[PDB]
């Protein structure tokens, strides 16, 4: 950490950047290096701007009259500023300094007297993890990673003690912002530290089942909510288990559905069955509607492709940095499923240009049938949801390159039979691109069953022999030892792929919450609703429909006094649980 | 069965009563010591019956639509074009492949027939084997007791 | 049932150390342990929302294993009288 602060003082040196002088390390610099170790979050703990621009104080910059890259409200310019009294996180200032110097025994004492306990442990899980990946090449990058999971387990035990007593206040402790840490609400601060173990603990997964399944309940079954999705008057019946019906707040049956349709469960459901039936609509125009013209049931697919790729336009304008247009899109380039989205768009431009050209309907018939299944990978992509599906569709995520493995094993091993079959017998069926049928295509059919035994059957004894010998090396070795390859690796990283799916579970809900409840036939209106607004508006200051719950002042001390009392209740337990471990008693 | 103009719907709606009672036949057959403690593993699977069905049989449709498209199939009737397009797709799983009818696009009739059977026979069979036997190992002492 | 009257009062107040002493001087030993397995399990499901509903459930399986070891000692010596001990009122 010192070598990074031996650089920002010189990447921003005395003459060109901190333009009077900077060989004197001042607190603006240590804020600027900390935002690198943290993420794309707010202005750091210490004052950046013109009040306390602590970058340019060795040369006589003016006093109180200046207020631009100098001192404004502090008392006297004595190669210092004055008492910037305590800046509201005075214990947390010792905590960050104790962490970056890797002082493991020292930093544990400072965290005991912390105020915002959950965030301050969790933030130190990110600063350590981003520092251990940086550099030592050994032996303390291991220790910093060891301290990171130590503070993680230290962070869980404070929330676990807090989750047990009155969990409805414990979820409020999770999603609150914290002025002491650059707002960085605690759930959001966990995820950039990638935090496998913290997100998987209990109520954190139960909090996500309360924002998803928005206003209704967690009790209602999945097979029973979908009935009222299609049957709109059956929603009003005595079937569904709301919270508005619990407090009998049904004064408007549209508002009974307005809270219902804005729940993330059915904006997911209505998007699914729009996407479940668009491929049915595409199945209509390949069977019967094979015409070289834009027909009646053809023009909507052009308006369907305009509807969904402009949802990326909603995501590009969603939450960027306000200068990097090409540095946010690399994250979409870091998603191969995003490259499977637009890769299923570029193949449609290679498919639509064969559909308008009239002399190429036969290549237009063969190149767009793979778009039906390339989108079916994207259909299963949004189907990483169910608790019996999600955590074990991650085992095929343990297998996606290994899809290419056993294919290239066994199907090339198919060729070891498929060439071996036609040789000894005198086969005579040949055509232009059906001798390949009678030699090569009839070899995969003799695997899963189409054996022309009147045609495949003097060399009958050897037609026994390799048909036994080849099926020996496949059906025994490539099936049932491949069974071993899975189920052991199924046993292996299972706890990961549980908690990985627990960690992946938030990324679906952030997409589906902060998005209006319009169906994809009606999402095109809301594509324009924010554009007509900017014929009236001019600045992006519409709304912040993020989790991001700001709190009132008299409620924050009504929570932070409660949490410190729960911290000291937890710390006395681990201090007692350490004494109860018998290996301590032999040391005793 | 008493209404005389509806014997053809009376022939199709009561054959499922033969197997709905066969669930009730197996219901009283939770008895034997090699049967009882391991018919509780299908009690670990009764909603999961609806799971892998709705997995694989919808994943059947991912082949069953993909099969008829490139070849020019021409067999159609009222409720037998559904035979020659849809019903002959589950039969090409457990074996009835009209290779003289399913077989120039012979190289791709190799390709997805390898590619689709890759994602079924490997992943949906033998990793599903993992899903059982681990959960068989899991709650076994429970399902004994 | 003058000992069993102290046993029920000691169980519902979750006094774990106290209730173990009272059960030692019990008369109908197998039933009195087993009945306390039900009173605890139906109370832990009722309400605290934490930290003693866990403890009451922990005491329930503690008294369960406490109840097995009395029957196990009784089942070994002359089990034809031990089954009579089971199905009696």
UniProtKB/Swiss-Prot annotation, chain C:
Its annotated compartments are: Cell membrane; Perikaryon; Cell projection; Cytoplasmic vesicle
Q: In which tissues is it expressed?
A: Highly expressed in brain and peripheral blood cells, such as neutrophils. Also detected in bone marrow, spleen, heart, liver and lung. Isoform 2 is found in neutrophil granulocytes.
Family the UniProt entry places it in: Belongs to the transient receptor (TC 1.A.4) family. LTrpC subfamily. TRPM2 sub-subfamily.
The record's note on quaternary structure and interaction partners says:
Homotetramer. Isoform 1 can interact with isoform 3. This interaction decreases Ca(2+) influx through isoform 1 and suppresses susceptibility to oxidative stress-induced cell death.
- The record's note on its domains: Contains two binding sites for ADP-ribose, one in the N-terminal part of the channel and the other in the C-terminal nudix hydrolase domain. Both sites seem to have a role in channel opening, but the interaction of ADP-ribose with the N-terminal site is absolutely required for channel activation.
**What name goes with this protein?**
Transient receptor potential cation channel subfamily M member 2
The record lists the organism as Homo sapiens (Human)
Q: What is the lineage of its organism?
A: Eukaryota, Metazoa, Chordata, Craniata, Vertebrata
